[PDB]
Structure 1
Amino acid sequence: STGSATTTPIDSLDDAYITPVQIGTPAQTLNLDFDTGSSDLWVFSSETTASEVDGQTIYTPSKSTTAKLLSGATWSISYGDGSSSSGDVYTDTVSVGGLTVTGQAVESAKKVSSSFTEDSTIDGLLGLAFSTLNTVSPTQQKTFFDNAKASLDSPVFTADLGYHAPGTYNFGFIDTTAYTGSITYTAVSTKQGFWEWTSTGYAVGSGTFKSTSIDGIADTGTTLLYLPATVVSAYWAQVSGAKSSSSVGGYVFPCSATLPSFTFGVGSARIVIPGDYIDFGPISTGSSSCFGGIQSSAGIGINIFGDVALKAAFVVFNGATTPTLGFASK
């Protein structure tokens, strides 16, 4: 089997991407944030505290003839950015782009943090990291991909995120028309539960490539590119007037600037992030200070190849017995 679904930016900045997902019988379609940095499929629901729901579409398990309470199971997650949610668990039928999993754990939120409430466009998350990170207790549950894998034509999914445009998540096949040149594959460590890999270096603009190992994760659920302070300083030093602002919480730059590209290495291959992808616009409406899309990972504890980086590539998440990651230009 295979599946193919379009993923759409939630706003004009590509802060996140939403993908329609069918849950239950008859189908209830919710727009979920596919997150290769976490491993829980959770939704706003009829059980979510009413004051914490503001415009989201909810899953109502009582209206699904295939929903079953997973008795005694609870979940609770805290994300790197400080947001969180928790609740109980149902199993139900879940379909993405024509690919159907029966008995998928659907984690129903009883509580969500303010950032989730305030984002009316995101009805929940669909985790695509390794199932070892799943938070359901006392019986850990599998991700949608893990459940689908055996049925898929090939045990892979691909992320093809757009810059200010829709893109695609495919399951079970590699669309050879969706990228240019070749896909370069690179080793993955699953030791921390992430799609963790080592980039071979970077360049700023038309500058020379610096060969240096940068361990990090491919994370579709993180907006920005978070890299070591040395690398980030070298990038922003090429932008007149750019500075790290403790009050804003990262690098800002004059909105009048033209940003240089940023290149990262994948083995001997190179992925170029155009300068415009690094512009996240005014820090507040009407400001001439703009927020940068490349930020320091210092104090996160891990480097994160988030959407800024991934949307410059066609990315293969190869879930074979020994997982790997593939990157192609597009």
Structure 2
Amino acid sequence: STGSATTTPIDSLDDAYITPVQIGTPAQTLNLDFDTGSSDLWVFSSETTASEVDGQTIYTPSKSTTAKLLSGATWSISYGDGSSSSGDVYTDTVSVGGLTVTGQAVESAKKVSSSFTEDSTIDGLLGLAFSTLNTVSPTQQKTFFDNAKASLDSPVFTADLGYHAPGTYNFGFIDTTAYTGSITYTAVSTKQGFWEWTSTGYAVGSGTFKSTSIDGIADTGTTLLYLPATVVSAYWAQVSGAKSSSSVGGYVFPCSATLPSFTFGVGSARIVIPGDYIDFGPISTGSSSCFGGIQSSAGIGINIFGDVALKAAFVVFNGATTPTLGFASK
């Protein structure tokens, strides 16, 4: 089998992407944030604390003839941006772009933190990291991909995120019309439960390529590109007036600037992030200080190839017995 679904930016900055997901019978369609950096599929629901729901579409398991309470199971998750959610668990039928999994764990939120409530466009998350990170207790549950894998034509999914435009998540096949050149594959470590890999280096604008190993994760659920302070400093040094602001929480730059591109290595191949992809707009409405899309990972503890990087590429998440990652230009 295969599936194919369009993924759409939630706002004009590409802060995140939502993909429609059918849950239950009859289908209840929720717009979920597909997140290759976590492993829980959780939704706003009829059980979510009323004051914490503000415009989201909810899953109501009592209206689904295929929903079953997973007795005794609870979940609780905290994300890198300081947000969190928790609740109980149902199994139900879940379909993405025509690909159906029966008995998928659908984690129903009883509580969500403020930043989830305040974002009306995201109805939950669909985790696509390794199932070893799934938070369900006392019996850990499998991701949608893990459950679908054996049935797929090929045990892969691909992320093709757009810049200020829709894109595509495919399951079970590689769309050879969706990228240019060849896909370069690179080794993955699953030791931390992430799609963790090692970039071979970087360049800033038309500068020379620096060969240096950068371990990090391919994370569709993080907006920005987080890299070592040395790399990030080298980038922003090429932008007149750019500076790291402790008050704002990262590098800012004059909105009048023209940003240079940033290139990252995948083996001997190179992915070029255009400068405009690195512009996250005014720090506050009406400001002429703009927020940078490349930020330091210092004090995160891991480098993160988030949407800023991934949207410059066609990305293959190869879930074969030994997983790998593939990147192509597009």
Tell me if both proteins adopt one fold, taking TM over 0.5 as the criterion. Answer: yes
Question: What SS does the corresponding residue of 1:234 show, helix, strand or coil?
Answer: helix
The residue that corresponds to 2:182 in the other structure is: 182
Instruction: Give the fraction of aligned pairs with identical amino acids, expressed as a percent.
Output: 100
Distance, in Å, in 2 between the alignment partners of 1:200 and 1:241 is: 29
Distance, in Å, in 2 between the alignment partners of 1:191 and 1:229 is: 24
Q: Deviations over 1:249-273 (max 9, x none)?
A: 0000000000000000000000000
Q: Offset of 1:241 from its aligned partner?
A: 0.1
Q: Deviations over 1:135-183 (max 9, x none)?
A: 0000000000000000000000000000000000000000000000000
Distance, in Å, in 2 between the alignment partners of 1:14 and 1:140 is: 32
Q: Deviations over 1:8-42 (max 9, x none)?
A: 00000000000000000000000000000000000
The residue that corresponds to 1:316 in the other structure is: 316
Distance, in Å, in 2 between the alignment partners of 1:299 and 1:227 is: 11
Q: Offset of 1:283 from its aligned partner?
A: 0.2
Question: What SS does the corresponding residue of 2:223 show, helix, strand or coil?
Answer: coil
Q: Deviations over 1:233-256 (max 9, x none)?
A: 000000000000000000000000
Q: Deviations over 1:92-126 (max 9, x none)?
A: 00000000000000000000000000000000000
Q: Offset of 1:132 from its aligned partner?
A: 0.1
Matches within 5 A, 1:198-209: 198-209=198-209
Is 1:247 the counterpart of 2:247 in the alignment? yes
Question: What SS does the corresponding residue of 2:277 show, helix, strand or coil?
Answer: helix
Q: Detail structure 1 runs of 4+ shifted over 2 Å in the superposition.
A: none
Question: What SS does the corresponding residue of 2:88 show, helix, strand or coil?
Answer: strand
Q: Offset of 1:77 from its aligned partner?
A: 0.1
Q: TM-score, normalised by structure 1?
A: 1.00
Q: Deviations over 1:23-66 (max 9, x none)?
A: 00000000000000000000000000000000000000000000
Aligned-pair Cα RMSD in Å:
0.1
Question: What SS does the corresponding residue of 2:146 show, helix, strand or coil?
Answer: helix
Q: Offset of 1:325 from its aligned partner?
A: 0.1
Question: What SS does the corresponding residue of 2:117 show, helix, strand or coil?
Answer: helix
Distance, in Å, in 1 between the alignment partners of 2:256 and 2:125 is: 36
Question: What SS does the corresponding residue of 1:272 show, helix, strand or coil?
Answer: strand
The residue that corresponds to 1:55 in the other structure is: 55
Distance, in Å, in 2 between the alignment partners of 1:150 and 1:209 is: 40
Q: Deviations over 1:195-219 (max 9, x none)?
A: 0000000000000000000000000
Q: Offset of 1:70 from its aligned partner?
A: 0.1
**Structure 1 alignment gaps of length 5 or more:** none
Distance, in Å, in 1 between the alignment partners of 2:124 and 2:37 is: 14
Q: Offset of 1:277 from its aligned partner?
A: 0.1
Equivalent residue pairs, number: 330
**Structure 2 alignment gaps of length 5 or more:** none
Distance, in Å, in 1 between the alignment partners of 2:106 and 2:268 is: 40
Q: Offset of 1:225 from its aligned partner?
A: 0.0
Question: What SS does the corresponding residue of 1:51 show, helix, strand or coil?
Answer: helix
Distance, in Å, in 2 between the alignment partners of 1:313 and 1:16 is: 16
Distance, in Å, in 2 between the alignment partners of 1:117 and 1:46 is: 14
Distance, in Å, in 1 between the alignment partners of 2:80 and 2:19 is: 22
Distance, in Å, in 2 between the alignment partners of 1:248 and 1:101 is: 43
Distance, in Å, in 1 between the alignment partners of 2:207 and 2:82 is: 36
The residue that corresponds to 1:282 in the other structure is: 282
Q: Offset of 1:314 from its aligned partner?
A: 0.0
Q: TM-score, normalised by structure 2?
A: 1.00
Question: What SS does the corresponding residue of 1:135 show, helix, strand or coil?
Answer: coil
Question: What SS does the corresponding residue of 1:230 show, helix, strand or coil?
Answer: helix
